[PDB]
């Protein structure tokens, strides 16, 4: 959270937090039952929101899911689509704490050494989480899907 | 470091599920007790310096253990437990606005209890001046917030025996 | 640092002596070696990183030590653990040059375990994961230098028990 | 050794031996027959080839050897020969090891500050050192000679 | 003392002290029998030699001694004063050392950071320093006067 | 670090004291002894290199602890045991102008038993060479500051057991 990131910078510089910081923290648990709408809503879809994107995808990457690829036969596809899973839960957490740094420890610091290792395009991934935010995108508002949509695009951005 | 929410999720990543139900209003109970904390910490800023007088005066001062002999005598010495007790409430402080001890444990309990009983810093006292501090300040910020700022100031102290 | 060589002499400069008669020896069969070691060296220095993939997919993949709560389960965590294999590959590699595991007791085995036991990284799975390179290597370098390579191989592991 | 110095100089860019490395350790190994054939034939020597070298010394440096002078009496003498007999089989070392790092490390790094103590003329160990090279280099061809001269050289150079 | 301040400035060189250090600590020694009567005066007139100055001060500072100031009632003022026999006591320290690091590291280091927190006037504290400087010093010969003088002007400027 | 003297107010101080009556002589026997002391320190000063010659060859030269393998055998080995006989009398020699062991306890004889069990440098040796140091001082010093020197010389080796 803000909460979190306010309290370091301010040990940093040995003093009580600024007025200024105080109003963040104090604006930012005010929206907080929102935050946790937008997080339950993508929750409550995971299940499909994962499946159509995961289509999307196949459909625009045929060289992942063909002979040669890496997600090739149900064995492997299987797992591409866990590994998709894996960063929606990844988004409801930055989307919680109005924070993006969950993300990063859980999921950024090192996923191309990761995936060089295994051989996995990270293009091809990329656009595999870009698919999501538009499958979950469809089911919030004007205004949650513009905030929840941020989360979604730091992800991408880092994944080239 | 962690607050109340980073550690909601954090437990619940380790299991692989998606935010609980139960973990959903721990996020919640935070959020509702939001402002309350800040508004608290605000308070506690304003009078942080003599939210450390009056406990030393309450505990320390005028006693054996600052006379010649008794470990804060010394125009090095005295400055020197001031200097700590501030650390106390600007760390309790934090705490509070966390919404969990993982600071304290993080950068203050750390071996706290080796150097002192180390250097001769007198444990039973230090913990006497910070008792000391929950008083002076549940008197200020209120007993809703004192309860919440006694429980991490009471961390502190279990966190040198 | 030492190899087979600088070993030698030390042994022989301890007692005073010059050069032995079995010591002559040693440097010979050493010297007669040579090539072949240098011969393996390349090749595990060409498939280095597949040398890893391999034994990592035989090992670690698709098991509980990756899943939520492993202790490779992280995107930090998993390539922290291949970080190490490569290590591993690496050193192995040079005392096989060397014809002497000094470097590993030197620039690796020291403290290794306690950092480990202190992480919680699974000493069982890394030595699995190791292991599973000796094949791994053994294959593309030969008999010969793969069970000069095994014997180093296998230093680095019993040097974490 | 050269293995053990690129192993070294390897290790600090954190990569494997690069081609040119082993080309040389390759090179090295080869040379190696004739190395310890060098080393042979000094140490079966070793007994002759310090008592010349240690007179041709005496001679020229008659105020080691008469009152006044470190080595005098056969007691302090018959140990000034005992430390040429030492460089010489270090001499041997470093000859095997192609390197002059065993020199250095077992005689070499505080030599000076060792024999100020002891009052020794530094510049006469070295005319001690010199005179051996010749006595040895004697009994080499005419290439076991120029190499295994480099490590008398390489002394000497530091007895200064 | 000079012996200390010596040792330690010549450890930082690595060497024996320089014959101009042994000089001093030479030509110190033998001011010794001196130093001592002079702080042995001190420390027989120190019940005295506080109070008038003690008077003194809360002339020129009624404020110290009155409604809404630091040492207010007998039980205030009387630690007051106890501050500053404190003091006299650090003089003869540094007086008998030749030095004046006793005074500084027993009473010096963070003397603001400490009576800040208690909200006592530092200026003021000076004053009753310096107040006493005269009581003594007219217990003294011309000379014993000035070195002693010096101790306790060294105080009163660290007050600001 | 302390000397006679800041060790003699030091001591009052925890008291609260102003200077005692035996305190007062303290100072003063100091005092007195001063000059022999800044005498001894003069004379060991421009010795200091022979004072370490003359006890090496008492009692470290031609032995098995210098012949190869006895743990000074080597040039930079000789080297380091000079090194640290020099540190000996040079730090002797302060405590003794001192009055007082307080250096040698502060930058010496903390954890040098450990290091020494460590390297493998022996202590029964070190401290001959070091009780030769002391006849070969109290030779040019004199009788009455060689007793002074001697008791620092044997505190230096009291601290290695
Ligand atoms: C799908 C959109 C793409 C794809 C995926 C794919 N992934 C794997 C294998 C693994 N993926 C991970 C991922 C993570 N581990 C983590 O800790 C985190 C952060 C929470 C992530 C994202 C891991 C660890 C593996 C290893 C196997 C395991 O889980 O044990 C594969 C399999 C590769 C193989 O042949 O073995 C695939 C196919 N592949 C694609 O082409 C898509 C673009
Ligand atoms: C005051 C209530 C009591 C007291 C304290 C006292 N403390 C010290 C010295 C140290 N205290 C600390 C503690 C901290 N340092 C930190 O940065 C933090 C926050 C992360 C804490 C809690 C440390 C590290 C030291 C030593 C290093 C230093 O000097 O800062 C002393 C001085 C001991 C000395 O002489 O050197 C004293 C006197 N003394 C009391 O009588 C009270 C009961
Ligand atoms: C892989 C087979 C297993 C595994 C490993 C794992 N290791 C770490 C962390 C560290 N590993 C080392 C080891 C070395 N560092 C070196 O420089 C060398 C060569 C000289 C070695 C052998 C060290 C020092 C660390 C800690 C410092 C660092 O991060 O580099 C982790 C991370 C633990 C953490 O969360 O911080 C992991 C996961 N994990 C497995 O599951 C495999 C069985
Ligand atoms: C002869 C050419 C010259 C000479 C020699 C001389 N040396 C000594 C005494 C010692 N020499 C050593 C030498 C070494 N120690 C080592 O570890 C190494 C590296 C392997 C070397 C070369 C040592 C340790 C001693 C001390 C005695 C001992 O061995 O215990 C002496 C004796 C001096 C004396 O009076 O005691 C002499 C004479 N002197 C010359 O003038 C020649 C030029
Ligand atoms: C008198 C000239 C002035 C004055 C003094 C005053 N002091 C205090 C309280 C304390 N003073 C000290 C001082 C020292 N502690 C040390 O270790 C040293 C170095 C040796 C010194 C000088 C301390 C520790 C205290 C705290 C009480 C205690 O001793 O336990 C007070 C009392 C303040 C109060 O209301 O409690 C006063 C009044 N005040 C003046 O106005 C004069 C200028
Ligand atoms: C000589 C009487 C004996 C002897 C000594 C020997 N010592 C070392 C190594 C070290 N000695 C010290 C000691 C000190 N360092 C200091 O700065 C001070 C003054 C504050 C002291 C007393 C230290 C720190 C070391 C290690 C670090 C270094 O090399 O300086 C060795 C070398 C061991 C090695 O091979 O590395 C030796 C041989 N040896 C003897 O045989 C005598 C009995």
């Not at chain 2, 508004?39 to 800023?45: E, F, G, L, Q």
Request: aromatic share 8%.
């Amino acid at each position: 959270s803000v909460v979190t990131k306010s309290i370091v910078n301010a040990d940093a510089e040995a003093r009580y937090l600024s007025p200024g910081e105080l109003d963040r923290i104090k604006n930012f648990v005010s929206t907080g039952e929102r935050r946790l709408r937008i997080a339950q809503t993508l929750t409550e879809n995971r299940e499909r929101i994962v499946k159509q994107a995961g289509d999307q995808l196949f459909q625009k990457r045929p060289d992942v899911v063909s002979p040669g690829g890496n997600a090739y036969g149900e064995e492997m596809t299987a797992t591409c689509l866990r590994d998709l899973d894996y960063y929606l839960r990844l988004v409801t957490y930055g989307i919680v704490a109005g924070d993006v740094t969950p993300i990063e420890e859980i999921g950024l610091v090192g996923v191309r050494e990761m995936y060089n290792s295994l051989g996995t395009p990270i293009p091809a991934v990329a656009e595999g989480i870009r698919a999501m935010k538009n499958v979950a995108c469809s089911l919030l508002s004007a205004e949650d899907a513009a905030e929840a949509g941020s989360y979604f695009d730091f992800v991408i951005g880092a994944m080239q | 470091m962690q607050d109340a929410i980073t550690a909601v999720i954090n437990a619940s990543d380790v299991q692989g599920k998606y935010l609980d139900t139960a973990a959903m209003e721990k996020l919640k109970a935070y959020f509702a007790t939001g402002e309350l904390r800040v508004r608290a910490a605000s308070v506690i800023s304003a009078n942080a310096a003599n939210i450390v007088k009056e406990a030393v005066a309450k505990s320390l001062l005028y006693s054996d253990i600052t006379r010649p002999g008794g470990n804060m005598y010394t125009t090095r010495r005295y400055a020197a437990c001031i200097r700590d007790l501030d650390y106390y409430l600007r760390y309790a402080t934090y705490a509070m606005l966390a919404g969990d001890p993982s600071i304290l444990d993080e950068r203050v309990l750390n071996g706290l209890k080796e150097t002192y009983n180390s250097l001769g810093v007198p444990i039973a006292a230090t913990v006497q001046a910070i008792q000391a501090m929950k008083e002076v300040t549940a008197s200020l910020v209120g007993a809703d917030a004192g309860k919440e700022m006694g429980i991490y100031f009471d961390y502190i102290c279990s966190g040198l025996s």
